[PDB]
From a paper:
Here, we present the single-particle cryo-EM structure of the Stn family transhydrogenase from the acetogenic bacterium Sporomusa ovata and functionally dissect its electron transfer pathway. Stn forms a tetramer consisting of functional heterotrimeric StnABC complexes. Our findings demonstrate that the StnAB subunits assume the structural and functional role of a bifurcating module, homologous to the HydBC core of the electron-bifurcating HydABC complex. Moreover, StnC contains a NuoG-like domain and a GltD-like NADPH binding domain that resembles the NfnB subunit of the NfnAB complex.
The second state is the purified enzyme with the addition of exogenous cofactor (FMN) and substrates (NADPH, NAD+, and Fd), referred to as StnABCS2 state hereafter. Since the cryo-EM structures of the StnABCS1 and StnABCS2 states are similar, we focus our description on the StnABCS2 because it harbours all cofactors or prosthetic groups ([4Fe4S] and [2Fe2S]-clusters, Zn2+ ion, FAD, and FMN), including the NAD+ and NADPH in the complex. The StnABCS2 structure demonstrated the full occupancy of FMN-NAD+ in all StnB subunits of the tetrameric assembly. In our cryo-EM structure of the StnABCS2 state, we find full occupancy of FMN with a bound NAD+ nucleotide. The NAD+ forms a stacking interaction with FMN, placing the aromatic rings at a distance of 4 Å from each other, which allows a complete two-electron reduction of NAD+. The comparison of StnABC structures in both the states revealed no major differences; however, we could observe the loop (residues 182–191) of StnB undergoing a moderate conformational change upon NAD+ binding. Astonishingly, in the StnABCS2 state with FMN-NAD+ bound, the lysine coordination largely disappeared and instead a strong new density could be observed between Cys114 and acid-labile sulphur of the C7. In our structure the residue C114 could potentially coordinate C7; despite the distance between them being too large (3.5 Å) for direct coordination, we have identified a strong connecting cryo-EM density in the StnABCS2 state of the enzyme. In line with this notion and our data, the 3.5 Å long density between C114 and one of the acid-labile sulphurs of C7 found in the StnABCS2 state may represent a hydrogen species, e.g., a proton abstracted from K170 or Y117. Notably, in the stable reduced state of NADH/B2(red)/A1(red) observed in the StnABCS2 state, electron transfer to reduce Fd is hindered due to the long distance between the B2/A1 and B3/B4 clusters.
Numbering used by the authors:
A (entry chain A): 18 to 167
B (entry chain C): 1 to 118
C (entry chain B): 1 to 584
D (entry chain L): 822 to 938
E (entry chain C): 587 to 704
Write the structure that this text describes.
């Protein structure tokens, strides 16, 4: 664990009231998730009532408590993509990759997550992979794309 | 001063400013259901069982979170409040696992408390 | 020569950086002095990535451009002066027909100015309203001009500003706060991200103006962290405004000081509501509190606070500059201003549309959107997202306003257009919208905690084929009670999709329940498959594309579908060229 | 008319009214009631002595009806309101009757104290 | 009565605290326990975890209650309206009964808190 370089984050954000969310976002940007040791380190040296830290980290719709792969898949699950049939794309992803949403692949290369909306609703369905968006998508297209990446 | 007086459920009562309607009704023997109310801490508004109808308000108000004023008319046993409380209790009973009374007592025809004297 | 590229978030969903760096390489090799400017989307997110070319006083747009297409553009048109007529869809003499009916007010800088440069905003009549309000008008004059302008509130709500905005100004306290609720938790509605990435200087000017008017010196932006490009552009604009004495202390010599801070939210849909957002800003769990007390009497840390959308703060300076008397002519009587919508779904010309109110929905769907994608039959339009309602095929004549949309059971909300044709199951759409509110409820009050899950269980049981008699009655009984008793605004307008699709599409619920079949035939387990023996001749195209082999038959003879083995995936009819696969 | 030959409100509610209309000689017959009304401080208007005829009260009813009452609620809650409206068709309204009716209909929570003697 | 087609959360809880028993199956999520432990006691040994149906009240970092900052005061027990929080048995075998109550004062501290012995 990289706690030595986690020390500057709460060494700089200290003294700001209501700074639990910012500390948690920086910790997740560093580690890719929120390990229990990092939460314990945040609870120490900044008090902030450890139970409240855990409740904040759990709520907030987005904070990963588990490690992720090198390429993070974010499937746009908005209204426009669901109208055009993103369920079939999700089924194709689950069939080809053998994983369920919220989990990680065995080789640690792909991680499936469902987001509310990516916002590029004109090119529905959309899939985000490490900030690269693929729009106007079909299951054959996503299978070819994931084969080309891997 | 001037004797702050409210009118709840048909009766006229003399109360003190700063108190909630829940406390004021309970001081005069009027029962309003509540689950999430403690008079020594702040209001929460989770259960919603303390809803009453107050004249001048379009929607039901939570008597655990509204302080008494002068000359306000309150009803606690209307159709709307009873419907809301029954729906809330049905939703709560939709999630509860437990034995209120043991099997031995419920099998007795006279419902003697077998667990108690055993 | 001027080249504009609408490279933004939707551009990343297209060629995006490819056309930009290819054009940069081409101009680097040629060595010409041509100004390449990254802009935001015009609003036509289809046909992206948009490229605008300036020849003299003429502007051409012939986009859908890749790296090879950009190279051909540079070789043929940028140097040779020859347009490619096979890609031309908009010229100066022939502009976009879609923008012909659009009174562009909120997007008057999108696709025109450089968002990362304050100079382009200043050259496009920007920040002049700021100087006018600072030097020539009093804050009371600002409030009265807003009042004659007819502004009451944007982003749902509806209560008038003068009872909340002027009330926030009149609120006692040495410290007042301004919050711009720049989180757009609505799926499919992306007006705030588009404004932030296309013209953040207008929003910064607007927030400065309302801060000057209400007497607040410090303000916050509640912006989600999945909005980086927007955060980077906003911080660049903030740095530029600090550098050019447009922000900070003593702007244009005037005594009023205004400083900016950017707060990145964690991204929860319930973290709006003006009481959960306060708790999020306060560093706690976003859970709605009890109203009353209102944030006008106790908001940020117990201090009075004014919270408004980006739309309101954008509209305020543009009212300030010209005058609210001009905007009283546009639209209906009861509500004034302009509306910003995002058209999506089974539509042809989808994307962001700027409109006035009073304009009929059939105009928006057909005349502006080009009709229905694949020329299908229009069925319904959804307004407000998961918290909104549905409008059927019989009410396209309803004008867009607060009162008319409130009449038909829907909610304005963020103002999102979803177009659904006859191939969308309505019960599945209600189930989807209710699943979104189930996944985004804070679970404090018991109605939104339990009842909205009970309705979801009913809907998922209907959309499988295990529904019973009376499920409509249980749905109505749950919906009215959840709407009445929920503490937060999320659970109050939670059953609006079910309540609007149960009175406008009640005949399909019975079809899913009694007949156990799906009228739209897009509702998986409620189907059956048959082969027409007359209109198909044994090419085995469907049986080859069913990798379980539940369809048996010889060559040049009609096949037989085994019902006990096929799982009704839907690929038995997607490839049949003779269309003899009947679905019942 | 109402079902019970009794007053519909208590004396304890005299302090929260914003208008008290006195009919009869309450001061001379029940003077402690006048003590309470005076100490409460609410606005009290006595029925004029020059209106000792029931036709003046009918003019009062007509002036109240012309001030915009809800006809549908009183139609569904009463019997014989249509004939009451018909019998007040050609009733003229005077100035003092109009002033009294305006005072009564303007106030949110009025009481009428009638001396039975 | 319960319908089998709806789901109630069943727990396999293992919290062998010597004094405080917590049953999430009987919780109505009124939040009185966390509010008292935060605002009154100040230990903040318990808190909310999750959203919606998945909201559950549990100690810090899902640790046992004996591994956290608990005082074992029992105020969470005293404010609970249901059987989700109960205190442990002082007698040889405790039972549900209507106990007789006598008012006395505590015999340990000079603060002299008033008690009801049941
Ligand atoms: N983007 C959007 O606009 C959007 C998104 C989702 C939901 N909604 C809508 O939000 C609405 C609910 O709004 P809400 O949850 O903020 O509560 P609300 O509508 O009851 O409150 C309306 C506004 O009036 C203010 N107000 C009321 N009385 C006041 C007083 N005496 N003094 C000062 N201010 C006062 C409130 O603070 C609030 O700003 C719903 O109609 C829902 O559809 C809107
Ligand atoms: C679930 C939910 C989400 C909301 N999201 C927003 C939002 O994103 N932006 C916004 O301005 N208001 C939002 N609101 C409504 C706010 O309460 C409202 O903006 C605020 O009370 C005052 O808005 P006004 O400036 O139009 O009066 C939301 C309300 C709810 C219940
Ligand atoms: S099982 Fe126990 S906690 Fe639940 S209702 Fe019955 S007595 Fe109360
Ligand atoms: S209505 Fe839903 S989101 Fe709002 S406070 Fe209640 S449970 Fe939370
Ligand atoms: S429907 Fe498909 S599988 Fe059946 S006979 Fe025709 S081509 Fe062959
Ligand atoms: S229903 Fe789909 S998966 Fe099943 S046999 Fe037919 S084509 Fe294959
Ligand atoms: S006090 Fe009891 S019922 Fe209330 S939330 Fe805590 S454990 Fe649940
Ligand atoms: S016993 Fe006291 S300190 Fe321990 S959890 Fe309960 S209230 Fe908190
Ligand atoms: S008197 Fe002392 S030991 Fe007894 S309950 Fe009070 S504080 Fe605790
Ligand atoms: S609806 Fe899919 S990206 Fe926005
Ligand atoms: S007692 Fe629970 S809402 Fe008031
Ligand atoms: Zn269906």
């Amino acid at each position: 664990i990289d706690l030595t370089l986690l020390e500057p984050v709460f060494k700089e954000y200290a003294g700001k009231a209501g700074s639990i969310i910012g500390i948690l976002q920086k910790t997740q940007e560093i580690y890719g998730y929120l390990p229990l040791a990092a939460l314990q380190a945040i609870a120490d040296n900044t008090d902030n009532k450890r139970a409240k830290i855990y409740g904040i980290a759990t709520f907030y719709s987005q904070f990963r408590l588990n490690p992720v792969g090198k390429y993070v898949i974010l499937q746009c699950q908005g209204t426009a993509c669901h109208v055009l049939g993103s369920k079939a794309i999700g089924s194709a992803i689950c069939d080809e990759l053998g994983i369920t949403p919220g989990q990680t692949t065995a080789d640690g290369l792909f991680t499936l997550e469902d987001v509310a909306c990516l916002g590029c609703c004109s090119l529905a369905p959309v899939i985000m992979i490490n900030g690269e968006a693929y729009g106007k998508l079909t299951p054959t297209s996503v299978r070819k794309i994931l084969q080309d990446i891997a | 001063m001037s004797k702050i007086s409210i009118n709840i459920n048909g009766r006229e009562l003399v109360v003190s400013a700063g108190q909630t309607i829940l406390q004021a009704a309970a001081e005069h023997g009027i029962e309003i259901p509540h689950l999430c109310h403690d008079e020594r801490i702040q209001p929460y508004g989770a259960c919603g069982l303390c809803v009453v109808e107050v004249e001048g308000s379009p929607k039901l108000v939570r008597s655990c979170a509204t302080s008494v004023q002068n000359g306000q008319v309150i009803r606690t046993d209307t159709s709307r409040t009873v419907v809301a409380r029954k729906t809330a209790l049905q939703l709560l009973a939709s999630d509860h696992r437990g034995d209120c009374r043991p099997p031995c007592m419920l099998a007795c025809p006279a419902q003697t408390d077998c667990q108690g004297y055993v | 020569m001027k080249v504009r590229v609408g490279l933004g978030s939707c551009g990343i969903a297209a060629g995006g950086r490819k056309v930009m760096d290819r054009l940069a390489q081409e101009i680097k090799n040629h060595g010409k002095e041509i100004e390449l400017l990254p802009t935001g989307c015009i609003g036509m997110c289809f046909y992206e990535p948009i490229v605008d070319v300036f020849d003299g006083d003429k502007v051409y747009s012939y986009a859908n451009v890749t790296a090879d297409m950009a190279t051909e553009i540079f070789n043929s048109h940028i140097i040779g002066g020859q347009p490619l007529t096979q890609y031309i869809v908009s010229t100066t003499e022939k502009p976009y027909t879609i923008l012909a009916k659009q009174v562009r007010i909120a997007l008057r800088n999108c696709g025109v100015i450089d968002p990362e440069n304050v100079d382009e905003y200043k050259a496009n009549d920007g920040y002049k309203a700021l100087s006018k309000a600072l030097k020539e008008m009093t804050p009371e004059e600002v409030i009265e001009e807003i009042k004659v302008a007819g502004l009451r509130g944007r982003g749902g709500a509806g209560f008038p500003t003068w009872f909340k905005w002027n009330a926030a100004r009149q609120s006692k306290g040495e410290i007042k706060y301004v919050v711009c609720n720049a989180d757009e938790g609505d799926p499919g509605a992306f007006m705030d991200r588009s404004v932030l990435e296309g013209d953040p200087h207008a929003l910064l000017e607007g927030m400065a103006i309302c801060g000057y008017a209400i007497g607040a010196n410090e303000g916050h932006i509640y912006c989600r962290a999945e909005y980086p490009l927007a955060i980077k552009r906003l911080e660049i604009a903030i740095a530029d405004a600090k550098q050019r004495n447009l922000l900070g202390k003593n702007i244009m010599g005037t005594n009023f000081s205004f400083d900016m801070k950017i707060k990145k939210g964690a991204g929860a849909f319930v973290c709006g509501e003006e009481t959960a957002l306060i708790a999020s800003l306060e560093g706690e769990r976003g859970m709605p509190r009890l109203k009353p007390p209102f944030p006008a009497q106790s908001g940020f840390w117990g201090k009075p606070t004014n919270i408004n959308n980006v739309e309101t703060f954008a509209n305020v300076p543009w009212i300030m500059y010209n005058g609210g008397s001009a905007y009283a002519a546009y639209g209906t009587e009861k509500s004034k201003g302009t509306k910003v919508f995002a058209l999506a779904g089974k539509i042809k010309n989808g994307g962001l549309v700027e409109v006035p109110m009073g304009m009929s929905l059939r105009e928006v769907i057909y005349d502006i959107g080009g009709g229905i994608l694949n020329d299908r039959e229009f069925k319904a339009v959804q307004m407000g997202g998961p918290s909104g309602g549905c409008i059927p095929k019989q009410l396209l004549d309803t004008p867009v306003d607060y009162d008319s949309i409130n009449k038909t059971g829907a909610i304005m909300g963020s103002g999102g257009m979803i177009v659904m044709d006859e191939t969308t199951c309505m019960v599945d759409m209600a189930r989807f919208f209710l699943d979104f509110t189930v996944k985004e409820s804070c679970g404090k009050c018991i109605y939104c905690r339990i009842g909205t899950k009970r309705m979801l269980e009913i809907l998922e049981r209907i959309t499988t084929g295990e529904g019973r008699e009376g499920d409509i009655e249980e749905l109505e009984e749950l919906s009215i009670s959840i709407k009445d008793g929920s503490l937060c605004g999320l659970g109050q307008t939670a059953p609006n999709p079910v309540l609007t699709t149960i009175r406008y599409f009640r005949d399909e619920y019975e079809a899913h329940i009694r007949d156990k079949k799906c009228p739209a035939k897009s509702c998986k387990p409620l189907l059956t498959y048959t082969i027409n023996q007359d209109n198909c001749k044994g090419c085995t195209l469907c049986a080859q594309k069913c990798p379980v082999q539940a369809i048996t038959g010889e060559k040049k003879k009609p096949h037989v579908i085994d019902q006990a083995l096929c799982t009704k995936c839907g690929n038995c009819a997607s490839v049949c060229r003779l269309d003899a696969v009947c679905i019942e | 008319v109402l079902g019970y030959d009794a007053s519909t409100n208590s004396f304890a509610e005299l302090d929260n009214s914003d208008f008290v209309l006195t009919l009869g000689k309450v001061k001379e017959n029940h003077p402690v009631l006048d003590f309470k009304i005076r100490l409460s401080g609410v606005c009290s208007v006595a029925w004029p002595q020059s209106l000792a005829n029931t036709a003046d009260m009918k003019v009062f009813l007509k002036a109240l009806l012309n001030l915009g009452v809800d006809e549908n609620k009183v139609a569904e809650k009463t019997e014989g309101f249509a004939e009451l409206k018909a019998s007040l068709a050609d009733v003229k309204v005077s100035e003092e009757i109009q002033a009294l009716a305006q005072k009564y209909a303007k106030a949110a929570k009025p009481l009428i104290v009638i001396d039975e003697d | 009565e319960k319908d089998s087609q709806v789901e109630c959360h069943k727990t396999t809880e293992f919290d062998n605290h010597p004094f405080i028993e917590r049953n999430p199956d009987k919780c109505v999520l009124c939040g009185l326990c966390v509010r008292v432990c935060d605002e009154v006691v100040g230990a903040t040994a318990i808190g909310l975890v999750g959203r919606g149906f998945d909201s559950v009240i549990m100690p810090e970092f899902k640790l046992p209650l004996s591994e956290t900052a608990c005082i074992s005061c029992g105020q969470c027990v005293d404010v609970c309206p249901t059987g989700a929080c109960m205190e442990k048995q002082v007698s040889y075998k405790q039972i549900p009964a209507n106990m007789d109550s006598m008012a006395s004062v505590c015999g340990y501290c000079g603060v002299g808190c008033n008690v009801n012995i049941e």
